[PDB]
């Protein structure tokens, strides 16, 4: 609504790894056949159709925007898991938080080595 | 299960980072020395 009415919005799904679990429970109780790790087949779609709504409308469509900051939770840093990889291949950037950095005193634990942002140059003030 | 060449730096454990640093420090030193020699040659070859 906000992005369609020329305003700017920010949405923070927290977590998406629990929406995936709720969807899996629904799908298993409707008797739909399971998939990998028991998640339904349509588990990528579930998220891709959801994170694709965070657009940046041009000035003809109001100019409004909707940023999204999905939060995923990995297991012992296994970024290679199923839902983490799906959402990593869906989103633009990433912000890797690591426990080894959290306890080494670096807080926020952002792992600047791996953290990425496709926009990069653009969307940054000239001084910064 | 076997082992292959260039596996210590594929794991990326402690030995991988240790080796990467042991290489980078040495080659930074040698690059500094070579750059100094290059500057000296530049100056000595102007005439």
């Amino acid at each position: 609504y906000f992005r369609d009415n020329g305003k700017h919005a920010l949405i923070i799904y927290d977590d998406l790894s629990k929406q995936a679990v709720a969807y899996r429970q629904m799908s298993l109780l409707l008797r739909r056949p399971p998939g990998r790790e028991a998640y339904p087949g349509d588990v990528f779609y579930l998220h891709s159709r959801l994170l694709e709504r965070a657009a940046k409308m041009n000035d003809a469509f109001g100019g409004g925007s909707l940023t999204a900051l999905p939060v995923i939770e990995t297991q012992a840093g296994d970024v290679s898991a199923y839902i983490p990889t799906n959402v990593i291949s869906i989103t633009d950037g990433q912000i890797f938080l690591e426990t080894e950095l959290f306890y080494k005193g670096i807080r926020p634990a952002i792992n600047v080595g791996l953290s990425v942002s496709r926009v990069g140059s653009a969307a940054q003030t000239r001084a910064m | 299960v076997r082992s292959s060449a260039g596996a210590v730096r594929d794991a990326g454990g402690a030995f991988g980072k240790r080796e990467q640093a042991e290489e980078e420090r040495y080659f930074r030193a040698r690059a500094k020395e070579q750059l100094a020699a290059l500057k000296k040659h530049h100056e000595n070859e102007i005439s």
């Binding site: - | 299960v1 076997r2 082992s3 596996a7 794991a11």
Partner: protein, 55 residues
């Protein structure tokens, strides 16, 4: 960890073990040579110290 983590770690440790075995062999050869060369130098140096402990 996962299977790939364990596989990579196992391969790395196997390489490390191979390298340390080779280095043990090299060090043993160099040790044998060093002992061989140390005997005469042992007598020579002990002689050179002779004076101070005698006077």
């Amino acid at each position: 960890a996962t299977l790939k983590d364990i596989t990579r770690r196992l391969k790395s440790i196997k390489n490390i073990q191979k390298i340390t075995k080779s280095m043990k062999m090299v060090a043993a050869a160099k040790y044998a040579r060093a002992e061989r060369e140390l005997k005469p130098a042992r007598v020579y140096g002990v002689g050179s110290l002779a004076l101070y402990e005698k006077a």
